[PDB]
Structures are given as structure tokens and as C-alpha cells.
């Protein structure tokens, strides 16, 4: 299948990913500024798992401490989305995703933001991704060399590069008969970038309604 050293790496993110929610949106029935507590709780569950994965990433710990932070703060939103897609398509039984979308359309959170979220999820759903793909891709998002306020850009590449070479070769053998598939997956990294803009804009609106955020979210997003 794959190289000696590469198999060990692949076989280590992936276990890392296996081991560190929705249903309250599904029933007490609710959309919200009134239910905002549910949101921040979810985001906070996302941020906590983001951090616990990023530690486990090979060489992450060796980076400058401020660069470390920038990568985290730089990647919260993208990972929050990329993880939701694995929940939405890969893990929820039939019918749950349908009510979920519709509950959300009812949120009073406007389609300008809602429609891109759902089109992105479908598109990646239709991509039929394995756990290895979701895991590895998550780790590529996090190790994005170009994030703002990074001091030593070249250190972060050299750390992402290895993950990218696993994933190409992975696609090559387990979506053989689809050589474009590896480019498709990468486009999803491009696709995710846009949500930060939307975040910023949504975040700003919530401060003008004086909403409460958890400690953690306070730190990760400078509120």
C-alpha cells in the first residue's frame, strides 16, 4: 500500500482522531438568539477537541509558541465546519440531517450564511470521504502555512508537506479510477476559507446584541 515511515504517521493521526452535541437542536424544538447557549456550547465542544488534536500533531509541539497559537486561532472555524460535515453526512441516521437543516433555516440565521454551509456539506458528502481522508485533511487545515501573524512560515510547511504526500498516495490506491479525487479534496480546504469571513460578520452582529461567550471562545476569537 504505502511507505514504512508513512504508514506509521498515517496510523498515528487517525488514532489521534478516533478519540478527541446535536440532539438539543432536534427537539426542545429551537432556533435562536434566544437559544444562543446551545451554539456556544457546541462551538466550545469543537474548540476543546481542536486543541487536543493539535497537540498530537507531529512537530506541532516543536513550533514557536506564538506561531502555535496563530495556527489554532487561525483554524478554529474551518475545523468546526470540516468536523460538522463528518457528523452531518457520515454520522447521524437517516432523517436526522433533514430536520437539522430545517431547524436551522428556522434559526433566524440568514441563508446568506446558511445556504453556503449546506451546499458545502452536500458537496463534501457527495465526495464520500473515508475517516482517513477526514482526519488527514483536518490536520492539513491546522498546519496551514499562510495564516496571519505567523513569524516562521517555512517551519509550518515542512510539517504540512508530509501529510500532503500521504494523502495523495492514499487517494491513488483507494480511489484508484479517480485521479482527480485528490484535487477535489484539496478544493475543500479552499472552500472552507470563506466561512471565516462569514464568522467575523456573524460574530460582530452578536456583540452588537451583547451575547455571552464561554471563556474558551473568548480567547480563541478575541472578544
Amino acid at each position: 500500500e504505502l511507505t514504512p515511515d508513512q504508514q506509521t504517521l498515517l496510523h498515528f493521526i487517525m488514532d489521534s482522531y478516533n478519540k478527541q452535541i446535536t440532539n438539543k437542536i432536534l427537539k426542545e424544538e429551537f432556533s435562536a438568539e434566544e437559544n444562543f447557549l446551545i451554539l456556544t456550547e457546541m462551538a466550545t465542544n469543537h474548540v476543546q477537541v481542536l486543541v487536543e488534536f493539535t497537540k498530537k500533531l507531529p512537530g506541532f509541539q516543536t513550533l514557536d509558541h506564538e506561531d502555535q497559537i496563530a495556527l489554532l486561532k487561525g483554524s478554529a472555524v474551518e475545523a468546526m465546519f470540516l468536523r460538522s460535515a463528518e457528523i452531518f453526512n457520515k454520522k447521524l441516521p437517516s432523517g436526522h440531517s433533514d430536520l437539522l437543516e430545517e431547524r436551522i433555516r428556522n434559526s433566524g440565521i440568514s441563508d446568506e450564511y446558511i445556504t453556503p454551509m449546506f451546499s458545502f456539506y452536500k458537496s463534501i458528502g457527495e465526495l464520500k470521504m473515508t475517516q482517513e481522508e477526514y482526519a488527514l485533511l483536518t490536520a492539513i487545515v491546522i498546519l496551514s502555512p499562510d495564516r496571519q501573524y505567523i513569524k516562521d512560515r517555512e517551519a509550518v510547511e515542512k510539517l504540512q508537506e508530509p501529510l500532503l504526500d500521504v494523502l495523495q498516495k492514499l487517494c491513488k490506491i483507494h480511489q484508484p479510477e479517480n485521479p482527480q479525487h485528490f484535487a477535489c479534496l484539496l478544493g475543500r480546504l479552499t472552500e472552507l476559507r470563506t466561512f471565516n469571513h462569514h464568522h467575523a460578520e456573524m460574530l460582530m452582529s452578536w456583540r452588537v446584541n451583547d451575547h455571552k461567550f464561554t471563556p474558551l471562545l473568548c480567547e480563541i476569537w478575541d472578544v
Binding site: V51, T54, K55, H65, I69, P215, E219, I220
Partner: peptide, 11 residues
């Protein structure tokens, strides 16, 4: 700042 992030990372 980012006291909590540093903590959660330095473990």
C-alpha cells in the same frame, strides 16, 4: 494572553 490556550497546549 491566551492563557487557557497555552495551558491546554502545554500539558
Amino acid at each position: 494572553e491566551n492563557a487557557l490556550l497555552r495551558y491546554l497546549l502545554d500539558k
